[PDB]
Each structure stands twice: as structure tokens, then as C-alpha cells.
Design a protein around this ligand. Structure first.
Ligand SMILES: Nc1nc2c(ncn2[C@@H]2O[C@H](COP(=O)(O)OP(=O)(O)OP(=O)(O)O)[C@@H](O)[C@H]2O)c(=O)[nH]1
Ligand SMILES: [Mg+2]
Ligand SMILES: [Mg+2]
Ligand SMILES: [Mg+2]
Ligand SMILES: [Mg+2]
Ligand SMILES: [Mg+2]
Ligand SMILES: [Mg+2]
Ligand SMILES: [Mg+2]
Ligand SMILES: [Mg+2]
Ligand SMILES: [Mg+2]
Ligand SMILES: [Mg+2]
Ligand SMILES: [Mg+2]
Ligand SMILES: [Mg+2]
Ligand SMILES: [Mg+2]
Ligand SMILES: [Mg+2]
Ligand SMILES: [Mg+2]
Ligand SMILES: [Mg+2]
Ligand SMILES: [Mg+2]
Ligand SMILES: [Mg+2]
Ligand SMILES: [Mg+2]
Ligand SMILES: [Mg+2]
Ligand SMILES: [Mg+2]
Lengths: 368, 20, 70, 29, 684, 51
RNA sequence: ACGGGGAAUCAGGGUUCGAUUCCGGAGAGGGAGCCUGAGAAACGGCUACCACAUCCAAGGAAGGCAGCAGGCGCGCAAAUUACCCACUCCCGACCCGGGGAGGUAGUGACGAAAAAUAACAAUACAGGACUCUUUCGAGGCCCUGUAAUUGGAAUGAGUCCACUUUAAAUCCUUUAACGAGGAUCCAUUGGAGGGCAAGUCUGGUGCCAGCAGCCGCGGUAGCUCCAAUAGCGUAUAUU
């Protein structure tokens, strides 16, 4: 029994849920009412990535490319190298790998080549700072569990390189994350490639000026990578991370415009805007940040049939559609209970998400 | 019509060393 | 990994081919080994041996006198 | 021939323990 | 001395208590315990069931068919089912039973059916077993009776744990067993406790109490052969069940559940029966088959409605844009955020405590919500009477229904409906007379399923190569690979050659565990290419017969080759005059009688053949007779094919002869140059 | 107790058997194994060292 | 840490054990109180409190296995919910009734005693045993060996009648008929060795070594020696 869907939006989650469920999916009418009717290259690049990290898959594309049929195989890890499309960031492909990595047959050692920092997709710095600690909460911690940035890449040239390694686990541990806690420290990451190193310092003194009043302890790291490590295009940006007493992480990031289009951005404006974007996240703060909500919900469903709870802020439209796809693929319905937080003055109202996992194990792992 | 167990089943000798 | 205290140790299986009876995540009974000493062809520094799996002695399984319950 | 072999077997037994073997090898060194 | 002696004894007793901790997922109100009664065909199985029912309920039932549920005690109910001699039922009941009553005829002794069922239980998860031996009224209360009891008990103690309880039924009074012996037997059933079995805990399953056909009558008049919709009633056991799921019914096939509904439970405990007002109905027996029984989105009430109650052709990004950013300069906006920032036990006991906290949270999480609300979030919990609606059932199931044969509905996990390549660790059974030949059909009992496939037997090498085997080894474990349904790792399996027919010997062929699942087999076979020397120049020899063209030799240049005698060589170049001949150098000189070969590895393949057993889709008298693909030996008997043996492959005495060598020849030039002392001296 | 394991395995005393020359090559002589070649190998080595 | 009579080990002196069938003390889930009686601070007597816990129509009512059996003490586990007052003794109004006190059988090689699994003859054919010896050698014979054959005596494990036993029985002891040549009516446990292919892996000193070998091209219709012997091993702690 295969599921049928229409459109090009939410393509990644449909393919990720299909391979974990083992049920085929049919996608129809991809960008039909467009001058270019076929699939985009970066979506085709994503499909090639799935074929390499799996074994036995069958993928069908029409001559026009308006329809896609995907029959998933079993997950096979090992050493993989992939050249990502420069249109989308590496983090666009990296989120899907974070969902599928613990269920491989062999531990995954993948090196990804493309663009690391971008305005559309989340930075690999943010995924390293926030997404990786979240998986450690589920028990996927390991010695080989790491993200390393070999060389940075900026659009349109790209030219970045990251290497990702993840252990394999038979089953996932349930979590009860209901207390967010108070923010202790703020850490940041300022980078400049193929430009003057003075750009990073002009970012630091702007973000620090806003955030020093709330918290005493802020320190922003500065990075300048030279030569082939710089990439093929100039740019600069800032990533900010907030750490709480309970161990949660809230993050925000911004990047400069690419060379080809857009007016030049003052580094002082970029520093101030990123700091305000972080404070917006704190007002919405939960146990997980808004970007990582869909990741947290998926790992809760894949538990060993136990009650699990997470406290998260306002639901994104991405997560709302993700919740509907979860009911279609895994037939799981969460129980939603909002928290008012009227006079606590913590900020906006939060949502408590609770569910019972379905019986799920790693079928790819070899018993020896 | 009754299937009685064999001598091998009744005494599970198994891999016992053979002696004189 | 010992159930009582969670320590991780290295033990001997008495014979090659008794490894086939043992699978991963199985429950085994472990006794001491090597107070007298270590024989030629034995690795020094290993002081434990596997005696039973699923409360059945390894020699009985090897000799074909018993079957391992699941 | 068998008598000669049995005499060496006793010497082999006379150091068959692991610590005994390492004992002489430091001493011969 | 007393302190040391007492302390070390208690530590040894604690070791018996230790085990691998697992979360307790049993319901607060458990379903009735499943009790199966088996034995040789005329041992007294049905007589014991009537005595047990009368012992607990003071009622006598006529024409018992299928499972019977009774109230036995304040807090326990039992489901009782009789097991026939047919091997198919023996396989199914072992997968579901919580308690097994095994009947032994003391006068005759042990029979094969007793030992076959014990092996089945060992494979699929060992339940609690109580042995009952009958027909003791034949003996005459002497040495012979006393020694027979000891002999049977100690042999029974090898298959189960030593010290296991046995029960003796001395004699029948009026065609019924004595009340005191039955009363004691029933008491031990009441207090028995059970371990969590791996397969039963993971998967939901149902033993069917009632079957009813839900089809339009005019459809049956139109075509009898039409697919039919069937409703099934039973208690839910094992794990939770979702509304839309795949379930396998052994003996029929795989199905998907259309509708599921919880129903008020019949044969409830008397305390719950007290709550509902009744006119002294006193329900204690339920057996329908026998006939006796029967900020707008932030709001929770709108957020839940929105989720579970243009966008397409748009960018897919997991980023939440801010539709209305705060000023972040006003003092009141700054005010709303300031509260965010800072202004002596065993490890076994501690791990057991953590397992208890998780188990308490699971039960108390949804207690406040209604049962209809609870079903949406956690599914149907075990212990509720439920109604199952199944569509597209074959018509032969309904028209050939037999109430004696149980109906089991086993829920399928994720991906268990798919097919793939299954790799198993396999050992031939010790009591089986024959060995298994690769590429011959065999029946596997795995998971919930019974099916026939074609396996490949292979062996592992230390370098990691899996090479094909002709036969299963007689005394060793062996790898087995076949194409079949996906099944989780660590589950046992059982092999039968023929489910139909009766044979005097042990019928279980082999036993093992599931190891790996994949889409590729990677199994390889050894292939040797053979040649013969025809021209010899010391180390170098010219070889013919290995290849048939000069293109063949070019592909294999530099390959390692050797003789039967063990001399190793290398291929150097191809010759011209014979089309396949080539030049090879060797360690030493060759003889013309030598044979050379090259060792190569050729990947193999297996056919994708999967034939499930469909015993329930048979006439009522013909449920035993199920057949499928025949093996190589059966096909040879059916036709006139006779085995012919190669003369070369047979082993024969060699009968070698004593070897002589020529005396060493010294050149005449060398003799002259030699010094006078060391010259060969011959007198003419 | 490794001796008990070895003694149980060695209960069966069948050893592997030797394969003979194929019939269509029977006129050539007996197929030589490693034991047969070792006799002619040491004989040639002995003479070469003497020469 | 209930005490003693006592058990083990010692040349002795001592040392270590002694809940445990005889004597003395103490208690009856826990601390207190009390009636009757010659005798009790009694618990198979009573009253209240604390902790547990059964039935209920919700008002009330009934409890104490460290007696004999029997169940439980996370899921992992070891004597029968047996027969009798025939013996020994105790209580009563009593020669006569009662007694899980006691007795009788059943039940895990945990401990102690005895003790099978064979004995006796014959025939044929071969020429080599055996001891001491660090590969050399020295002694030595009224026999040895043969997975070689042959014969008709003896007997109990068991099967099955009848006595005997005993409260009734069982067991032991008697005893009629069956019951042995691969006497297959087939003893085990620990330790140490040998034997092998067109087989597999690893390392090298061309032809070797290590580890090991029911897995080989085809094909699927029961070797030896040592210690003990109905017994024999392992781990932890210790002397
Ligand atoms: N004398 C004696 N006969 C018994 C005893 N137990 C069972 N039987 C016999 O068993 C017969 C009853 O057969 P069933 O009740 O049908 O037993 P079953 O094993 O289920 O046989 P099927 O129904 O054919 O499977 C009775 O007629 C008795 O003769 C026993 O303890 N003593
Ligand atoms: Mg019956
Ligand atoms: Mg005391
Ligand atoms: Mg005392
Ligand atoms: Mg007293
Ligand atoms: Mg008590
Ligand atoms: Mg008086
Ligand atoms: Mg008192
Ligand atoms: Mg009492
Ligand atoms: Mg008293
Ligand atoms: Mg008692
Ligand atoms: Mg217990
Ligand atoms: Mg008396
Ligand atoms: Mg009397
Ligand atoms: Mg007594
Ligand atoms: Mg025993
Ligand atoms: Mg013993
Ligand atoms: Mg004992
Ligand atoms: Mg004795
Ligand atoms: Mg009498
Ligand atoms: Mg004779
Ligand atoms: Mg070798």
C-alpha cells in the first residue's frame, strides 16, 4: 500500500518517512504550472544521495519529471562522498542525514562538498552546536559522533567541505524534557571568507552591545580561513547560541548577501540584526529551537513504545505539516496541551508535546 | 499407531568419547 | 558486562565453536579463571571464563545433550 | 627415538607455565 | 568464620535473582491466561479439561470446541484450548501459550509428540510447563511403580529445569479423575507467574473466540467464490494495536484490518460483575463456539483541531519566519524577557528502579482521558475485548471452518510485510536422520509465519568470505540464506520437510536464529580451471587445456596457479600454435603426469520462491494434507531417474611403488680436473 | 576443560582420503602428491650440492 | 553473642565451630494490660494501641503457621496440602476414647556401609618381546601377539505366580515358570597424546612454519595412554 502526494513542497520529509516506514510513495505534479516543469537539480541531487546511502532502492522519474515514484530499500552506511548542489546549502542535505544516520547497517562516514553557509538553509555551525547535543539526549552519543568543517563555502561559488560521522544504535531511549531552565551563557561564531578579517570584528562589537545588558557572559568566536579553505566566493556572517541550565540550546544566525545580487550589507547592521533574532527565539524559547522541532518529534515516535514528553514553543508550519505526515506514515497522534505562562514573565506561551512511541528497531544492524 | 521414542532419544548419550 | 555492578570484562570461551552457541545481548554465567596460571597459548591478563548460557552448561550444548531455550 | 623425545617432553613440562617461559627469556637475554 | 560463611552464601543466592531488566508493559487488568493441553492422541486430554472446568466453576459442558474462558479465582481467568496431534496446530499454539500442560502415558512411556513439542517451545520462547502423567492405575503399587516414576521424572528434568513439578493422576472413579488430585492441580495454575517473552511482548496478537460472516446474502447467491468480509472477536494480548494495521493469520494469509472497536468484556471478574446490576446471572463460563457463551493558532482546542482536522509548488524550508517582530527597544518589551536569564545498592537494583519509573509513567499518562480518547493516542491496550473486521477473506476459509482449529491474528511490525534476503545461523537437529541439501525446498516456521522456500547453505571463513556448501554439516552450525519475508533479528526458527503425512521418526529437521537482512546475498562458489603440461623446460612448462583462446589468457596473466602436487606457479604469456596454450614458470620442475589448476571464485544466486502454507484453506478432513515443491530425491523416485556415479570422483586405493633414482653422473671434464685425493676410483 | 572438548570432537576417527589419477590419463602414471614430490625434490637437491 | 553437655584439628599446649533431636533460658508480628486456675503475665485465652490484612446490603463482623503439610518473598524455580494410633509415651470420669507428640511409607549421589557388568577350557597362524639408556649403545628370553576362530557349564538385572512382612501396605529375606555371545542385556568423569585432502586463513627461511581441519571435484542413499571408578570435575573464600 503506497501513499500518493502532489507538489514539490515538503519533498524531503516524504522521502525520509518513506524509507523508515518501508512504504513506497508516489509524487505527482511537481511544478506543473511553471515555465520549467521538471524537477530541480538540487532535488535530483538529494535523490542521488539517498540512493548511495541505501541498498536496494528503486526510483522512477518521468521524461518530463513531473512525477516521482520511490520504492525504498534497506539502509546501508559505510564511507560515502557526495557533491552537493550549490543552489542549496549542505545543511539542507544534512538535516535528512541526521534523521537516518543511527539506523544504518554500518556507521556512516560521509564527506559533503558544496556550500556551507547560506541565507536560505541552516548553517552547519548551528547543526553542530544545537542539533548534535539533542541526539546525545536520545542516547546516540559516541566517540566517533562529530561534525567537522574542513573548508568553508559561500554562494554562488561554493567550495566548502564537511565530514559527518554517526554511530549506529539498535533502539532509541525515551526522553522527558519538560523543564527549559534559565540561560547561563551565550556563545557565538563569527566568520569571514575571501574578505578582510576586519569584517568579523565589526560584527562582534554590534551583537555584544545589545546582549551585554541581559547577561554578563558573552564571548563570540572569530574565524578566518585562508587559501583553499576560504572557498570560491566572498562573504561573512554570524551564528549565535544560547545555553540553559537544563542543557538546552537556542540558536539564530544570519549571513551576508551573495556577490551577484543584492546591496552590500553593513557588518554593524548584521551584528545587531542577528542579536535581535536571537532574542526573538528566547521569547519563544522551549526545550528545542524552532529549526530542530521536526527532528525531535521524529525521534520521539521511533522509541521503544514508551511515553515521552517535550516542551517546545510555537509550532512552525513545517512542523504542523510534519505532524500530519507522521500520522499518514506511522499512524501516531500526539497529545497537545498548551501552557499559558501568564504571570511567570518567561515570554510567550509554550506547547507541551507528549506521545507514546511505536515499536521500532534498527532492522539494518547485523546480529553477530 | 504409537510413535515411541528411540534408544538415542531415551538415553541422550550425545558426543561421548568411545572407550574399550 | 556484569549485571551486578555494570563493569566490562573480557572472558574466555572454552573452545572455538562454542562461539556459535553464543549470540550478542545474550545472558551468560561467568566464573573466575587463571589463579593457577596461564597455559602456553593463553593470553595473559584475562581472568574470567564463560561457563553457562541461558543457564545451560556449554559442554552439554557442545556434546549435544541439551538444547538452548529461547 | 621415542625415548629421546620423552626426555624433552619432561623439559617442556618443566617450563609449561606462561610466567616460567618469560622467566628464562630475560635470563638468556 | 560465621561472618564470612554467611556473607558469601547470600551473595551466591543473589546471583540467581539477577537478570536483564526490561520495562514491565503488562496491563493493570490482565487478560485471561492461555492454557494449552497437549499429549499423545488418546492420553486423556479432553477428560482433564472437563475436570478442570468443573473444579473451578461447578459446571459440566457438552461438546467443547475451541477456546473456553472461565473464572478461576478472584483475580485470575483462564482460556483453555486442546491441542491435537497435527503438527500445524502444535506450531501455532506454542507461539501463543502462557502455560502448557503436557500429558504422558506412564504405562507406555514417552512418545515422539512429547519431545517434538518441547523443541518447538524451545525455539519460539519457552513458557511455563507443568507435566502430568496418567494411566498409573495399571501398576500394582510395588518397586515397578516406584522406579517408573523416578525414571520418567528425571528424563523430564532434562528438557525442562531440574526440580520441575510433576502431577500424578492415580485413577478414574466413574470415568473422571479424583477430585483431590484435580483440586491440587488447579491450585498451582492459580499461583503461577510468567516471564516476559520477547516475541509476545513486541507484537499484539489475538486468539479468536467467535467468528461471524458479514456479507450481503445476494452476493453469495450471485457468486459463491466471492471474497467475503469476516468479523472476529477476542481478547487483545501482547502489545497495543492501531486502527489501520497489517496482521498475519497463520494458515490463511496476510491481511489489513479495516475496522476495530472495543466491546464490553464477557466473563469479567465477579468484582467488576458486582458493579453492574444483574439478576444473579453468575457468568463464569464463556464459550460461544461450544454454544454455552453468548495567538489564534496557539490555543490548544484550535491547535489540535487545525492539525488533525499555494502551499504546494512552494519552497521547502524548516525555518519559521517572524511575521511580527518585537521592537526590542521599549522597556516593556525588555521586561518580558528578564526572567529567562540567570539574575548501598547494586547496579541491578538501580537499573530496576529506573525501569519502574518509566512503567509507572506509561500507565498513569492517559488515565484521565476517556477510553475513546485513549485509543487515539496509545491505541488499543491489551486486555480489552475487541471486534476485528477483515475484508477480502478467501471463501474457502468460511465454508471449511473448523472450530477445533484455533484462529490466531498476529500483528505485523514495521516492514514485516516486505520481502528480502534473510541470513540465518542454522544447525541440523541432533535427532534428525537425514541431512539437508542446498537448493532443495524446505518449510520454515518463523515469527508468525509458516512457508516453504529454497535456501542456500554456506560457511564462513576467517577472512570473511562466505562460500557455498553442498550439504548441511552433520555436527556444526551453518549459514542459511533465502528469499522471504522480513523478520526482526534474534528470533528463532524451525525447519520441517513435510507437514503432511505421519512418519515414525523425529520430524524437526533443524533449528537456529535470524542474523541479518539485506538485498544482496554476496555468496560465492569455488571454480577451478584445469590444464595439463605438454612441454617442459625445467621450471618453465607449456600448459594446454585451461583456455580456448588467446584473449582468455590475456585476462588471466599473472594469476597464481599450482599443481596437485603443491608446486606453485605464475602465468606469464600466451603462445601462438595452440589457441589456448600459455607459458608458466614454477617453483620446480614438473612431470607430465602432473595436473595444474587455478583457483577462482564465482558468485551464485538463489531463486525467489516463497510458498506460504495454507492449511486452513482445506476441507475439514484434509487440513493435514498440504504439499508443495518436492525435493531432488522425491523427483527421482517419481520418475525413473537413477543416480549415476562418476568413476573419477570415487575414492580408491593408490598402491604406490618404491622409488629409485639414478646414480650421480660426473662429467668427464670434471673428473680430470679433480684433485687426486677426491676422485671417483673404478677398477677395470 | 579443553581436554573434554577435544576428546568429544575426536570421537569420530574418519580421515580425508586421497584422489587418484583420472582414467583417461592412466597411462601417464600415478598422480603425485606432496609426499611423492618431496622424495624427488630432496634427491635433486642432494646431487646439486655435491656437484 | 541463647548458655552448656558437645564437633573438628592437633606431639602437646591450644585454636576454630556449637541455630540443630539431651539439659536450662526466652518468645509467639510489635510494645503494654488482664481473667480463670494449684500452676500462665498463656497467645491453636481475653482487652486496648501500632503495623498488616479478610467479608460486607457500608450499619457492622472476624484475625495471628518461629505446630504438621502447603504457597509467597521483582521474571530465575528443589521433600507429600500422603497412611495410622499397631509401637513409645502423655491426657481424660477412662482396661475401651483422643493425640500432624510420635510411628510408617514417598521425595535432588548432600553424607556413611556392602557390592555386578563375567568365569573356565580349546584351536589355527605368525616371529619377535621386554628392561636400562638424552638419537650412540648395553642386556635378554621355557614365550608373546593376532578388532583370529571354537565349545558347553554358571548366574542375576529384568518379566511374572504364591507366601512372608505390616495397623494395612511397601522394601528386605524365601520360592514355581521365563530370562546371555558383539553375553548390542554395550560405565562414566577428569587429564595428556597421535593420525589426514586437488580443503581454508596468517606469516615467511624457493619445497617451510603456525593456527586448525565431519566445510574437498562429484554425490545423500566405535584411535592410544594416565588417575580414580558408581563415581568424578569447576569457581569463590579459607585452613
Ligand atoms: N484407566 C485410565 N484411562 C484413562 C486415563 N486417562 C485417560 N484415559 C482414557 O482416555 C479415554 C478418553 O479419551 P479422551 O478424553 O478423548 O482423551 P484425548 O487424548 O483427548 O483423546 P482424543 O480426543 O481422541 O484426542 C478414556 O476412555 C480412558 O479410557 C487414566 O488415567 N486411567
Ligand atoms: Mg479430545
Ligand atoms: Mg542474636
Ligand atoms: Mg545450642
Ligand atoms: Mg511464654
Ligand atoms: Mg511471622
Ligand atoms: Mg486446676
Ligand atoms: Mg501474651
Ligand atoms: Mg498458631
Ligand atoms: Mg501454646
Ligand atoms: Mg509449615
Ligand atoms: Mg520464589
Ligand atoms: Mg498410640
Ligand atoms: Mg486407644
Ligand atoms: Mg513431627
Ligand atoms: Mg542429576
Ligand atoms: Mg554431586
Ligand atoms: Mg541436595
Ligand atoms: Mg559411599
Ligand atoms: Mg497379608
Ligand atoms: Mg560361547
Ligand atoms: Mg601448514
Amino acid at each position: 500500500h503506497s501513499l500518493s502526494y502532489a507538489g514539490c513542497n515538503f519533498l524531503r520529509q516524504r522521502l525520509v518517512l518513506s524509507t523508515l516506514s518501508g512504504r513506497p510513495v508516489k509524487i505527482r505534479k511537481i511544478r506543473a504550472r511553471d515555465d520549467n516543469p521538471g524537477l530541480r537539480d538540487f532535488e535530483a541531487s538529494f535523490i542521488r544521495l539517498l540512493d548511495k546511502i541505501t541498498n536496494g532502492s528503486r526510483i522512477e522519474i518521468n521524461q518530463t519529471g513531473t512525477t516521482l515514484y520511490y520504492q525504498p530499500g534497506l539502509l546501508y552506511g559505510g564511507s560515502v562522498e557526495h557533491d552537493c548542489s550549490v543552489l542549496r546549502g549542505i545543511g539542507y542535505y544534512l538535516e535528512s542525514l541526521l534523521c537516518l544516520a543511527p539506523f544504518m547497517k554500518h556507521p556512516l562516514k560521509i564527506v559533503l562538498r558544496g556550500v556551507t553557509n547560506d541565507q536560505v538553509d541552516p548553517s552547519v555551525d548551528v547543526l553542530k552546536a544545537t542539533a548534535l547535543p539533542l541526539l546525545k539526549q536520545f542516547g546516540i552519543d559516541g566517540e566517533s559522533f562529530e561534525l567537522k568543517i574542513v573548508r568553508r563555502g559561500m554562494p554562488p561559488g561554493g567550495g566548502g567541505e564537511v565530514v559527518f560521522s554517526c554511530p549506529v544504535r539498535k533502539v532509541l531511549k525515551p526522553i522527558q524534557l519538560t523543564d527549559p531552565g534559565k540561560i547561563k551563557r551565550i556563545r557565538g561564531m563569527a566568520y569571514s571568507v575571501r574578505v578582510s578579517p576586519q569584517m568579523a570584528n565589526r560584527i562582534v562589537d554590534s551583537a555584544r552591545s545589545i546582549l551585554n545588558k541581559f547577561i554578563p557572559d558573552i564571548y563570540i568566536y572569530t574565524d578566518h580561513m585562508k587559501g583553499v579553505n576560504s572557498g570560491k566566493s566572498p562573504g561573512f556572517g554570524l551564528s549565535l547560541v544560547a545555553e540553559t541550565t537544563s542543557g538546552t540550546f537556542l540558536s539564530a544566525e544570519l549571513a551576508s548577501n551573495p556577490q551577484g545580487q543584492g546591496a552590500a550589507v553593513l557588518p554593524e547592521d548584521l551584528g545587531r540584526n542577528c542579536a535581535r533574532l536571537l532574542l526573538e527565539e528566547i521569547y519563544r524559547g522551549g526545550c528545542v529551537d524552532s529549526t530542530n522541532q521536526s527532528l525531535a518529534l521524529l525521534l520521539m515516535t521511533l522509541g521503544q513504545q514508551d511515553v515521552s514528553k517535550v516542551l517546545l514553543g510555537p509550532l512552525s508550519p513545517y512542523t504542523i505539516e510534519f505532524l500530519r505526515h507522521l500520522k499518514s506514515f506511522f499512524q501516531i497522534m500526539f497529545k497537545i496541551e498548551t501552557k499559558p505562562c501568564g504571570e511567570e514573565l518567561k515570554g510567550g506561551d509554550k506547547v507541551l508535546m507528549t506521545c507514546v512511541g511505536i515499536g521500532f528497531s534498527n532492522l539494518s544492524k547485523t546480529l553477530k | 499407531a504409537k510413535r515411541a521414542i528411540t534408544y538415542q532419544i531415551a538415553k541422550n548419550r550425545g558426543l561421548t568419547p568411545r572407550r574399550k | 558486562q556484569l549485571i551486578k555492578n555494570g563493569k566490562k570484562i573480557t572472558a574466555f570461551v572454552p573452545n572455538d565453536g562454542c562461539l556459535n552457541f553464543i549470540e550478542e545481548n545474550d545472558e551468560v554465567l561467568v566464573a573466575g579463571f587463571g589463579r593457577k596460571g596461564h597455559a602456553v597459548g593463553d593470553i595473559p591478563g584475562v581472568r574470567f571464563k564463560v561457563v553457562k548460557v541461558a543457564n545451560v552448561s556449554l559442554l552439554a550444548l557442545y556434546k549435544g545433550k541439551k538444547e538452548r531455550p529461547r | 627415538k621415542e625415548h629421546f623425545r620423552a626426555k624433552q617432553k619432561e623439559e617442556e613440562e618443566k617450563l609449561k607455565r606462561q610466567k616460567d617461559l618469560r622467566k628464562k627469556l630475560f635470563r638468556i637475554q | 568464620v560465621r561472618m564470612a560463611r554467611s556473607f558469601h552464601r547470600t551473595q551466591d543466592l543473589k546471583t540467581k535473582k539477577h537478570h536483564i531488566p526490561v520495562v514491565d508493559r503488562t496491563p493493570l487488568e490482565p487478560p485471561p491466561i492461555v492454557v494449552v493441553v497437549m499429549g499423545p492422541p488418546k492420553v486423556g486430554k479432553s477428560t482433564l479439561i472437563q475436570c478442570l472446568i468443573r473444579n473451578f466453576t461447578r459446571q459440566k459442558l457438552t461438546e467443547i470446541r475451541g477456546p473456553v474462558t472461565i473464572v478461576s479465582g478472584k483475580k485470575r481467568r483462564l482460556t483453555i484450548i486442546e491441542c491435537g496431534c497435527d503438527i500445524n496446530m502444535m506450531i501455532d499454539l506454542a507461539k501463543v501459550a502462557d502455560l502448557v500442560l503436557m500429558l504422558i502415558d506412564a504405562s507406555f512411556g514417552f512418545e515422539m509428540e512429547t519431545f517434538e513439542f518441547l523443541n518447538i517451545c524451545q525455539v519460539h520462547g519457552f513458557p511455563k510447563i507443568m507435566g502430568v502423567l496418567t494411566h498409573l492405575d495399571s501398576f500394582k503399587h510395588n518397586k515397578q511403580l516406584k522406579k517408573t516414576k523416578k525414571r520418567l521424572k528425571h528424563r523430564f528434568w532434562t528438557e525442562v529445569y531440574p526440580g520441575a513439578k510433576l502431577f500424578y493422576l492415580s485413577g478414574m472413579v466413574h470415568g473422571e479423575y479424583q477430585n483431590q488430585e484435580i483440586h491440587n492441580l488447579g491450585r498451582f495454575i492459580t499461583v503461577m507467574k510468567f516471564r516476559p517473552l520477547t516475541w509476545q511482548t513486541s507484537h499484539p496478537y489475538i486468539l479468536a473466540d467467535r467468528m461471524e460472516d458479514l456479507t450481503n446474502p445476494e452476493d453469495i447467491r450471485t457468486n459463491i467464490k466471492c471474497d467475503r468480509k469476516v468479523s472476529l472477536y477476542g481478547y487483545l494480548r501482547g502489545a497495543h494495536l492501531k486502527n489501520k494495521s497489517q496482521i498475519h493469520m497463520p494458515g490463511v494469509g496476510d491481511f489489513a484490518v479495516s475496522d476495530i472497536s472495543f466491546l464490553p468484556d464477557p466473563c469479567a471478574l465477579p468484582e467488576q460483575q458486582k458493579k453492574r446490576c444483574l439478576n444473579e446471572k453468575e457468568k463464569l463460563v464463556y464459550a460461544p463456539l461450544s454454544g454455552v457463551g453468548g495567538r489564534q493558532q496557539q490555543a490548544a482546542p484550535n491547535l489540535r483541531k487545525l492539525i488533525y482536522g499555494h502551499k504546494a509548488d512552494s519552497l521547502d524550508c524548516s525555518r519559521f519566519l517572524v511575521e511580527a517582530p518585537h521592537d526590542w527597544d521599549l522597556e516593556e518589551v525588555m521586561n518580558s524577557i528578564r526572567d529567562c536569564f540567570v539574575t548501598e545498592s547494586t547496579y541491578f537494583d538501580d537499573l530496576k528502579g529506573e525501569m519502574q519509573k518509566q512503567a509507572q509513567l506509561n500507565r498513569a499518562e492517559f488515565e484521565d482521558q476517556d477510553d475513546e480518547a485513549r485509543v487515539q493516542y496509545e491505541g488499543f491496550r491489551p486486555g480489552m475485548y475487541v471486534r476485528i473486521e477483515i475484508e477480502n477473506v478467501p471463501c474457502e476459509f468460511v465454508q471449511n471452518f473448523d472450530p477445533h482449529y484455533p484462529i490466531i491474528l498476529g500483528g505485523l511490525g514495521n516492514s514485516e510485510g516486505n520481502v528480502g534476503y534473510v541470513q540465518m545461523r542454522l544447525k541440523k537437529h541432533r535427532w534428525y536422520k537425514k541431512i539437508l541439501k542446498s537448493r532443495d525446498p524446505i518449510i520454515f516456521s518463523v515469527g508468525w509465519r509458516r512457508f516453504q522456500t529454497i535456501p542456500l547453505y554456506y560457511i564462513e571463513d576467517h577472512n570473511g568470505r562466505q562460500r557455498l556448501l553442498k550439504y548441511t554439516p552433520q555436527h556444526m552450525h551453518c549459514g542459511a540464506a533465502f528469499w522471504g519475508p522480513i523478520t526482526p533479528q534474534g528470533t528463532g526458527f524451525l525447519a520441517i520437510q513435510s507437514v503432511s503425512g505421519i512418519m515414525p521418526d523425529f520430524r524437526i529437521a533443524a533449528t537456529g536464529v535470524v542474523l541479518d537482512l539485506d538485498k544482496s546475498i554476496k555468496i560465492v562458489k569455488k571454480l577451478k580451471l584445469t590444464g595439463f603440461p605438454y612441454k617442459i623446460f625445467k621450471n618453465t612448462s607449456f600448459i594446454k587445456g585451461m583456455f580456448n583462446s588467446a584473449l582468455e589468457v590475456a585476462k588471466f596473466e599473472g594469476a597464481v596457479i599450482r599443481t596437485v602436487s603443491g608446486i606453485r606457479g605464475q602465468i606469464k604469456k600466451a603462445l601462438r600454435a595452440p589457441e589456448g596454450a600459455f607459458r608458466a614458470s614454477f617453483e620446480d620442475k614438473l612431470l607430465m603426469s602432473d595436473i595444474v589448476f587455478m583457483r577462482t571464485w564465482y558468485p551464485v544466486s538463489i531463486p525467489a520462491f516463497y510458498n506460504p502454507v495454507t492449511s486452513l484453506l482445506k476441507p475439514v478432513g484434509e487440513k493435514d494434507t498440504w504439499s508443495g515443491m518436492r525435493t531432488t530425491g522425491q523427483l527421482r523416485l517419481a520418475h525413473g531417474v537413477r543416480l549415476k556415479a562418476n568413476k573419477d570422483s570415487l575414492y580408491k586405493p593408490i598402491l604406490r611403488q618404491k622409488k629409485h633414482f639414478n646414480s650421480l653422473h660426473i662429467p668427464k671434464a670434471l673428473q680430470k680436473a679433480l684433485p687426486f685425493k677426491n676422485k671417483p676410483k673404478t677398477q677395470a | 576443560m579443553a581436554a573434554a572438548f577435544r576428546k568429544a570432537a575426536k570421537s569420530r576417527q574418519r580421515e580425508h582420503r586421497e584422489r587418484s589419477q583420472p582414467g583417461f590419463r592412466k597411462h601417464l602414471g600415478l598422480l603425485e602428491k606432496k609426499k611423492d614430490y618431496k622424495l624427488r625434490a630432496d634427491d635433486y637437491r642432494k646431487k646439486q650440492e655435491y656437484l
